[PDB]
Design a protein around this ligand. Sequence first.
Ligand SMILES: Nc1nc2c(ncn2[C@@H]2O[C@H](COP(=O)(O)OP(=O)(O)OP(=O)(O)O)[C@@H](O)[C@H]2O)c(=O)[nH]1
Ligand SMILES: Nc1nc2c(ncn2[C@@H]2O[C@H](COP(=O)(O)OP(=O)(O)OP(=O)(O)O)[C@@H](O)[C@H]2O)c(=O)[nH]1
Ligand SMILES: Nc1nc2c(ncn2[C@@H]2O[C@H](COP(=O)(O)OP(=O)(O)O)[C@@H](O)[C@H]2O)c(=O)[nH]1
Ligand SMILES: Nc1nc2c(ncn2[C@@H]2O[C@H](COP(=O)(O)OP(=O)(O)O)[C@@H](O)[C@H]2O)c(=O)[nH]1
Ligand SMILES: [Mg+2]
Ligand SMILES: [Mg+2]
Lengths: 420, 420, 429, 429, 56
Amino acid sequence: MREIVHIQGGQCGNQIGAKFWEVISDEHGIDPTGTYHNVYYNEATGGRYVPRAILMDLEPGTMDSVRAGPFGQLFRPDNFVFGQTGAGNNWAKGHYTEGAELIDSVLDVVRKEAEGCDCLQGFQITHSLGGGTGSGMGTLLISKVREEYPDRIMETFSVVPSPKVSDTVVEPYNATLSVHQLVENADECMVIDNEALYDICFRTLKLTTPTYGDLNHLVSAAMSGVTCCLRFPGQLNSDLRKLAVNLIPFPRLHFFMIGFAPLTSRGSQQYRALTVPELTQQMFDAKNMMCAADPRHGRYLTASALFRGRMSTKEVDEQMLNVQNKNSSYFVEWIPNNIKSSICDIPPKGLKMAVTFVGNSTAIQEMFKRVAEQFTAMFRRKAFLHWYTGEGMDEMEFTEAESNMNDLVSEYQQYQDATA
Amino acid sequence: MREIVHIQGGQCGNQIGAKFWEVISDEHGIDPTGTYHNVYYNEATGGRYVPRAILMDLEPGTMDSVRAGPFGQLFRPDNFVFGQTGAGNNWAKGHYTEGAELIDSVLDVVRKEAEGCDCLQGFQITHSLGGGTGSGMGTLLISKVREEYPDRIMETFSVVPSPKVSDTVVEPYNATLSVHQLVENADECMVIDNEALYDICFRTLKLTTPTYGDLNHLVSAAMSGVTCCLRFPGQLNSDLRKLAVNLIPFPRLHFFMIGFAPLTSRGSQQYRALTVPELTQQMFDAKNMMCAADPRHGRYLTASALFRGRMSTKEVDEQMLNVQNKNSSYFVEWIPNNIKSSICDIPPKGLKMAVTFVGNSTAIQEMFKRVAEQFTAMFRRKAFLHWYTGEGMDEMEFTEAESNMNDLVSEYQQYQDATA
Amino acid sequence: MREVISIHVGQGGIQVGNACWELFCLEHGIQPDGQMPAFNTFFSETGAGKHVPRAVFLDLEPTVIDEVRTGTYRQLFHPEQLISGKEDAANNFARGHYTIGKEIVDLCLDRIRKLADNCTGLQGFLVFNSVGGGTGSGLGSLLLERLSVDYGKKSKLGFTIYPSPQVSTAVVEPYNSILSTHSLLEHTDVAVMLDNEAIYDICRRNLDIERPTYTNLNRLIAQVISSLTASLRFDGALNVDITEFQTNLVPYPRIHFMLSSYAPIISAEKAYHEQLSVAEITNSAFEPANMMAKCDPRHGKYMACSMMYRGDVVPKDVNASIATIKTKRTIQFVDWCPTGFKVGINYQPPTVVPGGDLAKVMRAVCMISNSTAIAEVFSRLDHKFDLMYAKRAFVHWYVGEGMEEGEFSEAREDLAALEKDYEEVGIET
Amino acid sequence: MREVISIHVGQGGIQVGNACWELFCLEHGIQPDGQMPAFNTFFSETGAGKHVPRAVFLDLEPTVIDEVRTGTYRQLFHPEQLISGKEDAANNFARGHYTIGKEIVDLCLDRIRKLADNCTGLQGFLVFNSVGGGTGSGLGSLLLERLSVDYGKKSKLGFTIYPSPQVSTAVVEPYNSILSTHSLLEHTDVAVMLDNEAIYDICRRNLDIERPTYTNLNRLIAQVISSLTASLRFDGALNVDITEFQTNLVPYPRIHFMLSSYAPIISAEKAYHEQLSVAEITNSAFEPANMMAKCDPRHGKYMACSMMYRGDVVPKDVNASIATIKTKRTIQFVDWCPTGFKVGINYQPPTVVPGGDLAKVMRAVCMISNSTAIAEVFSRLDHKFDLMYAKRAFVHWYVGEGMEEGEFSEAREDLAALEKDYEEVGIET
Amino acid sequence: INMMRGDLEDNLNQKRRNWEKNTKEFNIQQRNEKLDYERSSHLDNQAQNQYHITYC
Ligand SMILES: Nc1nc2c(ncn2[C@@H]2O[C@H](COP(=O)(O)OP(=O)(O)OP(=O)(O)O)[C@@H](O)[C@H]2O)c(=O)[nH]1
Ligand SMILES: Nc1nc2c(ncn2[C@@H]2O[C@H](COP(=O)(O)OP(=O)(O)OP(=O)(O)O)[C@@H](O)[C@H]2O)c(=O)[nH]1
Ligand SMILES: Nc1nc2c(ncn2[C@@H]2O[C@H](COP(=O)(O)OP(=O)(O)O)[C@@H](O)[C@H]2O)c(=O)[nH]1
Ligand SMILES: Nc1nc2c(ncn2[C@@H]2O[C@H](COP(=O)(O)OP(=O)(O)O)[C@@H](O)[C@H]2O)c(=O)[nH]1
Ligand SMILES: [Mg+2]
Ligand SMILES: [Mg+2]
């Protein structure tokens, strides 16, 4: 009941999804053979647990990899709908040219996955924004299914481009297109960025050789913690919608920030105590989150915190109220108790307490200002446009897309100034 | 009681009949000797069981093709009506001059096989539609026996021309000539294409060396599952006439489609369970039918689902009601609850469930339309006409044949638009 | 219960027949002595012990019939099917159509009748005549007419070695070739134009033999014949009886002149570095370069195309490959034939000739194409005719043998009237 | 499932292709016998054991093709994918593009079609041709036009050996370089200018060998090509297909002439001595001493930089080093491209060719750059053109081969316009 | 039954590859016998040329 269809997509989507299903198989005690030793898995003959998930890419590369690595037997081969021509970092190439040629089968399998459910609650996506395959295919799929399923909610665990050193040079174009699409037909654009992950792995775990495995494991932990207070017993339960309703005051204002706690090295593990005050110290610090927007250089329209662990309750609420009424400047004023909490009863594997802290803030306006600025600087010279027009598209969208982008921040800053 | 005389003819007829008697002998637990270890076989001195099938052709090579193969010694040699001259792949040859002055012996054999029964029910023929000897002798025998035995019923499992690329170059001519003899003298005719069988065996079972043996095996399994609800006990048993009355609303809309379920690959079988919602999800799929006419381009005037094995009838009825009310567009309305069910009580040899789907759809008309093009584009130039003319064939008949075909497709075009 | 009767008139006919009987004997496991150490289609047992072939070997020069009478097969053919006269044909049609054959046709027809009396499932005839010569042209056409007025309904194929486009093997060829073509117009249901120019090219390029000879040519012709007859001979998931070709590929009653092709005719090395699946094999089968006849199918339309596959072949690839090959725009069909394809399947892989240049391979295709570009060939050939009939060259060697001169005119014009068909059928509706 | 075609036209192209195929057979572990004891990108299995490489070798001079047919790799290639002419190109572009170029390019297109049909997810084309040569320009340009009019959407990335501005191996390089440049301007999407001089000072400053020979140059170019294709070949943390390149580094459809660089380039004497840290290796990658094209990158301003890391790579220090490089004052990009670095990572170190003067090392960076300073090359090259067309030197050798005399002007004119754009981009806003 | 079907198809594919390698054996034998043929014919040509030229 209240199932979830996981939609992969793009190279980043495939890798993060592999890591996510790894973490879920760990938590629910599933070995990589497929047996046990309904919210996510589907039962199959002989007690087998096949993950309710779908992979996709215009290239069979990362699919081949995740089918070769660990936990490659779980996902059924009917859900590996994959083209062989590749997209190649061209959003139009993966949203207008090959979109119409593979989206048919993708919608077919997604329908056969959703109808196979009884009472679906929401969707949940993992993709990038610059890479053609990820951004294009994923946002086209979101468009189709949201124009198909109107009542259920969306979830985009989207990795935005890093600020300083990009991964692709034409990144801002695909980024602004995907953010003008997802702002219209998606309820949570939970943004993640790599450089903050690097700063974390150097500052709060001491791993001086940060490989993508550890970053993917961290975002996997956050993603799992997002919904853990649903598939477990809870002193005060939550879901994908209690968040979604305690979070967004206005449907456009739905671009969150993420944070996980606690994070410790091997040396620090022995000494650091695990009680809700230091968990709060961590979850409300700047260098602890996974976003390129200093939370101390903005405010919080709202912020929810899912706890995990058999701990007290009065102290949770007391520390929430203290953190609020202390930094009342760093929070917004016109809303009362802008901090929402929830508590489950089962901690993760390896700890005893855990906090997934998500927040609808207004600091990400810096990130969108940076992206819009790069867009202007790369567009006012028609640079790299002869690709995005050879694939059936006129510059109009871009401008209007960027136009919509402006309005977005034009609201954020506004609400950061109102006082009543 | 309620016997069946299976007549074959032509190359496709003989091969499909060989594999079909193989499958039947497998079902009733027989070995190629013909001993056990009335609807189909006949007892013979010493506990032997001889099939009640006559095998006819104009070319005695196909005999040595079917006889030498396994499960071959069954058919009694007093039935191989094999003219020793030739066929030539021409209709008028096998219907007026050469394959016509032999039909008297075939009538003799059919009569000796019929008058020896107690309550004969219906004839069950398997033959091609464009093959000279096959189609020609099939339609001639149809005319004769249907003018002769109207008390019984008629059923023909024909194979249509491969839609995309042909297998003979004069196939439209003979296909139309046979169609003009079918709608006037038949009572049940299912159609099968050699094209959708490839797409199935290659995208449903992941085969790499699909031999005509295996495709014939699939078709024969479907044919056996059709009438399996008659010779076996059942919570609700059907026959060859309950279909003929619950399917055809008018004496000519009698061209059905065939679908078998379940059909699974190796991995896809490892990952999916055997529960009747899954069989239903696989049954209605357009990529799962033996007729190259996507039913999505039309509706179902009616569709009978003959199950096998053992299952709660409430599950069957809930699946039927859900698939009917949910796909409310792909079903026509002026015939309420246009889907019929039936449940026998014997699973296949080595499964737990089974589903045969016989569907009178208004979507196959398109296929006929296709032929209505080719024939028309092969008549204004009088192409290849002189071969058929060389046997006394009056071209006038051709005309009305096409005309007849017109009405046929016109009929369907009048109904998928009908509203109430 | 099904068999054929092969005739090999003329000089080229007996050669290709020698090679073809070599291949047949060495496929069925029939020793050159006629004794074994499927054959009902070609051979027949003499009650016990040895096989004898179903054939008749006519000629007028005693040279080749003697060479096979004392060659390696001196003890295989019944000595009554080797009919040789006294004088020679001498490349003039009337010598083998009015004077010499005038009575030899009687003995030949009586022997053909005695053969057909023994056949049980006779399907058709497979003649072999190099029309460029005298006896294979004249006597060949006379025998064709005699059979067509004697038996009738029985199909009649043919494998004629027409004059090449460019290289020369005689000078009076356009006369006794046009006469044979005019006398072959109706009595023969299937003409398969073979030309020694394209096969020389192939043997030069694909078979890598730089110095070929009619031996290798005839090996390849025998391979084509056997790959065509494998349908009747051995088993196949989709067989065709030669009366298939009589109705799939003869749209209009007069036009039946088609061209053949085979694949893969590749040497040992050039195939050792090759996957060589059905896809490549059929995309090469359509190639105009390696057609047995000589023409430019890229400059004409197709009308019908039969393709017999042999060997371990997967049908799905057959279907997909024919689909993609009908997808091409350079290969187009005429309006009045949308279903322009015919296929057959035989489970017998190709047999290699011990000591043959051709390499062994599992999958092979044989294509019989009724096209409309081959038309121009006749024109070109007819072209030559005019440049000889403009001054009545060489006509006295013909009028001296009872042949009415006016005949030439008729044929030369009536064959030209044949063009009225071709250049018409190439026009869409 | 995904693969690339490899074309090697000209003289230098074929030698560097020989080296590149040696390296490719070595990396995957393929023996020169074809039998082996990931290759879908390059090789193709021949049903049972052996492998044929996706490659064609065009050259009108048999000498190098004869050498490769009788070299150490006589057994690998297909005996037809080694296409040889009979006469030299003679460094006059018209010879390999109008007179004889019409003879063999059709055979190349036939072979390329038959080689692509047996592929499924083909992505691009990697042609290899010196521009200074005769057939490396004429036949190369003709083939490129044929492929453009034939396929289309398929990417095309040449690797041309442009003549050095100082070292000279011919006296008519300007002519048949301007011509092939004007031809290739609109056909090949991404043309990487690989010079032949700067590699000499490279292998004299790093490998410390004083008297280098062409074979070393070809081995180094082979190393660059393998370091490029390793993404589609192997697995890694950031796979970057070939269709990635022509998507990131082509700001305007006309300005795409990029220069490459490779590191680490060090022989064994200091290999153990030097540390070769990621920071220092990416610092050496950017120093103007070791750019394959003879240019000082400081003259202009970069526009795009694709850096491909292979081997043991730690992304954190990668980003730190890239940031330091971005803060270096010696290098800077144009204003309108803030996101300047595209990065890919793989999971495989280089491999060493026995005899390759390079040394084995865990990490490797191949960095390609679409920049502005490269413009000057054309200028100086264009310089020479004037001092030839001011006196119609060597022009009659071209006018005698069908090429119109005044056509040069057009080509020259067009390159001027090219230079125009190389100044319309370097300006701020 | 799934395991049995998997094993049977594995065996069939093995038989396929085995017959392919058999055919490759045959092709290499063919090429080498052709080379034998051409060299022996060259020596025979030299022999006949000596026999014809020394025919004074
Ligand atoms: N395929 C093939 N063609 C041949 C062969 N020998 C000759 N030909 C062709 O047949 C033609 C020779 O004309 P002939 O058949 O010898 O003349 P004829 O009709 O037999 O008249 P006579 O010599 O008097 O018996 C030429 O076109 C040859 O190319 C052969 O062995 N194989
Ligand atoms: N990088 C590299 N360049 C080479 C090599 N060999 C020759 N070159 C270049 O080839 C150019 C000479 O022109 P060619 O390519 O030989 O002329 P062509 O068009 O191939 O035709 P020909 O005149 O018959 O040789 C010179 O600029 C050489 O630098 C090599 O091995 N490696
Ligand atoms: N946190 C994280 N981000 C990744 C990873 N791999 C790729 N990304 C991002 O994914 C983006 C590429 O998008 P994608 O469409 O999947 O690449 P494409 O398939 O070549 O078009 C790049 O901007 C990368 O930065 C990873 O392993 N971890
Ligand atoms: N699935 C299947 N189709 C066959 C088989 N044999 C023939 N067919 C069909 O038979 C058609 C040709 O007509 P056919 O009846 O064989 O000619 P005839 O028997 O000589 O009159 C072709 O379209 C084939 O598709 C078979 O064994 N299996
Ligand atoms: Mg002769
Ligand atoms: Mg050269």
